[PDB]
Design a protein around this nucleic acid. Structure first.
Ligand SMILES: [Zn+2]
Ligand SMILES: [Zn+2]
Ligand SMILES: [Zn+2]
Length: 87
DNA sequence: AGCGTGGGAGT
DNA sequence: TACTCCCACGC
């Protein structure tokens, strides 16, 4: 992992330069990505994308359990729900 | 429950 | 560099 973070007291290292640059927004507070509906800004474009569903109500992730109609905005919410049904 | 926001990864 | 994804932790 040659891409080391030189910020004060940070010991993180990464194998990819883009992982380091993304990480460094934690230290600087930079939030490049802005929601066009509510104007909130975010550190990461993928988190802007899932945030925008709070406004649209879209829930593309459907439970696969027979006779369950529950749906979710994000994949990990569905993971948690499937775990709940039986594990 | 719903969602902010990291790391690691694939493309 | 760009993008999103899964997985994860946390509140
Ligand atoms: Zn750092
Ligand atoms: Zn918004
Ligand atoms: Zn279900």
């Amino acid at each position: 992992k040659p891409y080391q973070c030189d910020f004060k007291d940070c010991e993180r290292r990464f194998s990819r330069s883009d992982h380091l640059k993304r990480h460094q927004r934690r230290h600087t507070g930079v939030k490049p990505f802005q929601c066009k509906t509510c104007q909130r800004k975010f550190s990461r474009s993928d988190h802007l994308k899932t945030h925008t569903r709070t406004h649209t109500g879209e829930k593309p992730f459907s439970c696969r359990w027979p006779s369950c109609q529950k749906k979710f905005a994000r994949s990990d919410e569905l993971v948690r729900h499937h775990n709940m049904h039986q594990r």
